[PDB]
Symmetry: C4
Subunit: 445 residues, 4 copies
């Protein structure tokens, strides 16, 4: 039961030295196996893998968190059937048929840990985990998540998506049929239309408060950092910001400001786009939402900086050039923006001098932006998509895993009765003269 | 002549265990050689391949249907020239020249089977068959398809395409010169122009009925399932829907509804587009038609969901924002759609408050859809084509095979004289003192 | 001097059996060595390589023509320095330094053959020649083409390009300042402007006649076939068609038809775009002209068929739908075309019924063409360009070779004094007691 | 201390014969190591590496300049610990831990050489250097660049970028609020607004003069040639051109010309665009600036030639065709340009005859340019990016290196206190009884 200065034991050290190469994988797995067996023989009373570091991470949890696929895949699929060693086996084989094995896996601290489980550390990783997307392909995790999806989570997720659709329809109806008199709040009339509208407004604000508190719960439970605040937590941030716009709309509504509409429409717009959160977790249709997240966070910042540099530079040049209607910098910025959307006039004003200078500026602007910068954006998108589609293919599973964990955490029964299988003695051997059962889960493959 | 619970013999089991890898192919090949020789020696009177499974599939038909290209390539190119074994040979070599062999192939259950032939099961596969595109490159099948194409089917196909062109020209003329009086049906006038118009309408409806019954015949013969209804049968579904629009147009025409025009134009719009069906089967020009069938079935659903989520979200936000002409959600949806086609005004109304909110909403919509989502679609399509052009290169041949089989099934002569080859005694050895001929087919290659 | 049943020599058989694979290349090389040595020993009086096949091609010319790059590379780089074998060597080494060799090559039947040379057959190939792009990288051919380029051809080519630019400027000026009175021809006034205009017209027609006769000379010398008329001869066809439009313009001008303008502008348009012919042969800028040729001949036919099917189908549907401006099929075709160029109105007429049907037709047309068909075009172009840029990189050199051969064939001095090198005795050994000189060409590489 | 016929030492010859292949790397490395040791044994008093070639380049500086990455990596990472040989080692190992080494590097002639340092030659290369992108990843150079970045250069660079932002804001404000009276210069009024305006103008011209003299200093220090003037020096050329426009604006302003505005706006349009120079050196956002540089220098020339050939040809054809408002060639050129930006009318005039000819010309122009040429540009850009993204990844670091060297060279303190580390005796052994210290630099890696 040795420990290091950080508080971790030797098995954590074996995890850390991993780098997921073939020879490193062989070395680390062999050292893990041998040291664990030796620890069993010297101290059969005390298990090493139960020992956490100062961060409360077991070697399995550290291997999962740090993105070590060789180590995690070894540990989760570690079958030990030797004398005085079976009692630390992670999995077993009941039926040893040729094409198919009826393996049984111990799910201790993989679903329920009460500190942090393998699924929890994988799904709630910091996004720096190099193999988190492929880490769930490890047999017990893949089959466990698929089982939990089909068992109860699929229905709950579809119900939540349906309810969100109802919420957005109600919100859209309540906002669309908003009153057009001045100075809110608006007195209710006894007509049924006002009762339906105010019910819609109340449900809209109720959903806003729900998402607001859900966002707070997420941020408090996760405590993310600014450096990775948007790289992770993107969907939760968008839902939280939607709720923020809803609540600012409520404040302005009861503060007697027309500007409540200014907030409400944004929330409404955000609300509909937030339906893409529910498309993630579908392999067929979730690709676009993941790519939108990735491109907005990664690619849109640099492109928009360059594009705005071009647009502002040429807009300032043009608005300087003209003199007298379009003399504002805003109008010129909009006119130069129109070229991007294929609606630039290319002679939008005569009130100026030096025709050649003006047309040269506009031609250079459209060549640089419309013909060149946009096509360069397309080229970079083509390259990066060609590289990352294979990653999005697994971001599917990763988001489904997050969904499963969130559903288990809520669960709406005030209980954690979400276990799958196991009612009989599992191991058949202990260092003592007893037997143990640790939530055996069967995988036929 | 052992059998299993489904009724299938050991050869079907040898097919099922295949996975088209090199070592597996060698294993199944060797097992086939051993079991066939044993069948010859123990039961020369009993054929193994004639045995069908529960679904009426022979081992050859199962190998073809299940997409086991290695096993099928072995079986169709199986040359046996050993004592007391030649009688099970599938092919022979008459001329053993250096660069070229005059191979001779058996066509039993290749074109005529009376249950289901190799060409029938390959062509009418469920599209999940992993090797359907490349499976027809197996030498006897490729040569059979090319031979039957050049011999009879090429002329018949071009005639059918020409007749369909005549049908669409007649339909276009009859619809274009429709009368403009009220309340159909319209009385035939004695002028020759109206005689031609009514003849064109009659031929148009006649072709509609023809395609309607052809669609019914297809659905009854194939019995497609909902899960694979569109990935297979796409062209037949489109022709059937065209005919459905034509027949609804006829009903509305004789039901005294102007709305018949609404159906007729759709059928017309479908009919010309359905000419792309005839474009498939030409290696050069078919590439778009195939791609269209793919891009609609795979890419359009998800893209249109995301695009409509963005469009509806920002459209309902904008229509909420404006107040007073454009106040309907439909008009705002169209105005925001116009940005996609490069015709968005970006100031299409002044009737609102909070100009900053309105322009921010429109700019965000433009960036999310026009710049990001459309270019993302382009990126994904580029990646997809980069991956799938090599498969389209052969789905050309697959569609030509479907054309050949349909032409043979119709054949319009009240006969089944559609065999490919064979006029000479073939085998040279039987376990009895006789000889056999089984439609010998020559391949000089 | 062995021959086959057709009368071609065994060397021609060795060329024909080649397939440019490594083992085949080694086999044919060894057979060439053996047969050439045997020819030297048995019949030193008569050389094998001089004997032509039935088509009048030598084995070197056949190897070049048929695209057997390994055989040609072997032959042209064949150094033989053995007893009683030097006299048939193709090349030598004067300075055998480590990093560099001063190789010396025989140019027999490389530039001057009087039947067909290696450069002539490579440059004037059928475009199916698999290695024509890389075949000119064989050391003596690449060095000779570069030598001819730098020596005299580059100046002549740039002079011709400059003169063509002058011709097009003159043609543009003469056409731009055409008279606007009725019923040509136009009587000259004594003003200087008319004299300059008629001089420009005379030079324009003179250039037209020049290009007409050059096209005829090309077609007579090459005798291209319809199946490969455009895959080769594309630039010459375009120049010929330009000249045809010019001559039709002349006929209409003197036939008292205003329609001469209709022809002239087409020639003028072609006359400018044909400058891209001179762009080929420059590595930096010749990429676009090559790709325009390739895409028009390969990709534009099928894309335009599919696009016109969509456009015509939906245009006919829409023009059927509307009733009463825009009621012609031409106007509707133009309005639907405008969507492709980002200028579709999407409500271009109110004179119709069934708003939903009309807008559904237009939206479906937009999605099918503007969003899908154009993006599928882009995807296919991306794929094919990713595959063929490496071939364009060398068709640069191929077009330069064609330019060099054309310049030699003209040469503008009434002579053929276009030899590259050699003024000294070359071989040093003959089967007789003499010595020979065969245009030695030196390469320091 | 032997030399060759050029006067360069044997080590320069060893550098020249390198080609960065593995076997060549071993060959040259072994010969270099052995000859250096032999030089130590025979002439320990005189070092070989310090000796320059005719161009003033040491073998290290030549290896860096000529792009021989293997030789440079070996030399910079050359450790010798043998008797009478360790005194010429380039680096040492202080701590020989397993996963990490505390290497110690000698920086002689890496930052300061007084003829040519490694950083100077790499950063100020001619852009033909094949390995300049990856050459800075050699351990001591990468660590030096990162150290100098974090130590003092990062703050100085961000300060300069901030000051340039302030300069452009001041320039934009001064130009935007230019007076609108006639005939400059404009008399200064005593109102505060005009004092701020004239202060902004003075600061704008001051910055222009600063950038003018900085450009002159760059061109004098580098003395670039026309053939590589733009592939290198691109940013410096753009800053110089901005300053030239500013100074021409000053001359016209004091020359009593309104046309000063024509220059000033260009400088303004230049200046904002030149902010992209500062995006290089940030990995995330510097990709677009590098891509735009490469695109403009490589692809834009050929694309614009082909595009302008098409545009001018069809504009001349159309302007010839029309007759009577659009009759100028400029107006027709603009109308045909509008198709490129998605705003072509396709019936912009009726003043012609032969509508079919006019529309055919415009449709052909659209298909050739809008559909084919632009999408061809997209395809080529996609392929280009696919190949060159890996180059841009390191061009980031290369431009950061240029920034570091420029900051050290200017440094604005009248001092050169920009050394990294080293205050103790370094070598520990010399052929004499002495010891030496040469700016020992530590790398823990
Ligand atoms: C906090 C992030 C960074 C974000 C929040 C708002 C402001 C947002 O602008 C962005 C920045 C932006 C602004 C304008 C155009 C593009 C991007 O992108 C998102 C954010 C961008 C989106 C588009 O991305 C999505 O919401 C789709 C989505 C994909 C995957 C998901 O997991 C998801 O979870 C909800 C949502 C939609 C907006 O919320 C929206 O509808 C409005 C009016 C602006 C978009 O900021
Ligand atoms: C049943 C399928 C799914 C389909 C039937 C109709 C409604 C269709 O809309 C689609 C959905 C759609 C609607 C609007 C835009 C794009 C797609 O696509 C096809 C279908 C889509 C097509 C485009 O695809 C093709 O038919 C070309 C084609 C390619 C390959 C083939 O083998 C083929 O066989 C006929 C046809 C044309 C339409 O029939 C048409 O002309 C109209 C007005 C709508 C198109 O539904
Ligand atoms: C004979 C060929 C096939 C061709 C001849 C004419 C009709 C042409 O239309 C085409 C078909 C066409 C029509 C409309 C749009 C695109 C293509 O393409 C070329 C041909 C297409 C071209 C574009 O291709 C080029 O001429 C550039 C070029 C590239 C490489 C070359 O080696 C070259 O040699 C001259 C020319 C320009 C036109 O001649 C032109 O300017 C007009 C008015 C129509 C074009 O027919
Ligand atoms: C000397 C070069 C070749 C150049 C100088 C001027 C004329 C320039 O036109 C170009 C040619 C040109 C003209 C019109 C459209 C595109 C390109 O490109 C640049 C040059 C092109 C650019 C766009 O490229 C950039 O300057 C961004 C940039 C990227 C990377 C950098 O390291 C950088 O350093 C400042 C700048 C902007 C202009 O200076 C500009 O704002 C105007 C009005 C024309 C552009 O000439």
């Amino acid at each position: 039961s040795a420990r290091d200065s950080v508080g971790n034991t030797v098995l954590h050290a074996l995890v850390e030295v991993a780098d997921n190469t073939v020879d490193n994988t062989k070395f680390v797995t062999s050292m893990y196996n041998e040291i664990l067996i030796l620890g069993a023989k010297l101290h059969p009373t005390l298990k090493l893998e139960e020992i956490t570091n100062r961060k409360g991470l077991t070697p399995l949890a550290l291997a999962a968190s740090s993105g070590k696929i060789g180590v995690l895949a070894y540990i989760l699929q570690r079958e030990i059937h030797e004398p005085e060693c079976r009692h630390l086996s992670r999995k077993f084989t009941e039926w040893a048929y040729g094409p198919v094995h009826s393996s049984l896996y111990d799910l201790s601290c993989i679903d329920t840990c009460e500190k942090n489980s393998v699924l929890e550390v994988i799904a709630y990783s910091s996004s720096e985990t190099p193999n988190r997307h492929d880490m769930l392909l490890v047999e017990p995790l893949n089959r466990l998540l698929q089982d939990k999806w089909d068992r109860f989570v699929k229905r709950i997720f579809y119900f939540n998506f349906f309810v969100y659709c109802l919420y957005m329809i109600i919100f859209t109806a309540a906002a669309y049929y908003r009153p057009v008199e001045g100075l809110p709040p608006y007195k209710l009339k006894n007509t049924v239309g006002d009762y339906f509208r105010v019910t819609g407004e109340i449900l809209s604000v109720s959903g806003g408060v729900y998402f607001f508190f859900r966002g707070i719960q997420y941020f408090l439970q996760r405590r993310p950092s600014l450096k990775s605040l948007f790289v992770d937590s993107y969907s939760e941030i968008l839902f939280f910001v939607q709720s923020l716009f809803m609540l600012v709309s409520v404040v302005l509504y009861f503060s007697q400001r027309k500007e409540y509409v200014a907030s409400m429409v944004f929330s409404l717009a955000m609300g509909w786009t937030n339906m893409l959160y529910y498309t993630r977790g579908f392999q067929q249709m979730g690709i676009y939402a993941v790519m939108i997240e990735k491109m907005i966070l990664r690619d849109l910042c640099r492109f928009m900086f360059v594009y705005l540099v071009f647009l502002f530079g040429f807009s300032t040049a043009v608005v300087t050039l003209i003199e007298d209607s379009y003399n504002s910098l805003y109008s010129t910025c909009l006119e130069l923006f129109k070229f991007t959307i294929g609606m630039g006039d290319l002679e939008f004003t005569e009130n100026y001098d030096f025709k050649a200078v003006f047309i040269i500026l506009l031609l250079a602007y459209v060549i640089l932006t419309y013909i060149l910068l946009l096509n360069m954006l397309i080229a970079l998108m083509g390259e990066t998509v060609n590289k990352i589609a294979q990653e999005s293919k697994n971001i599917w599973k990763l988001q489904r895993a997050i969904t499963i964990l969130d559903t288990e955490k809520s669960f709406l029964k005030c209980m954690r009765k979400a276990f799958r299988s196991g009612k009989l003695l599992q191991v058949g051997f202990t260092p003592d003269g007893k037997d143990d059962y640790r939530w055996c889960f069967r995988v036929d493959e």
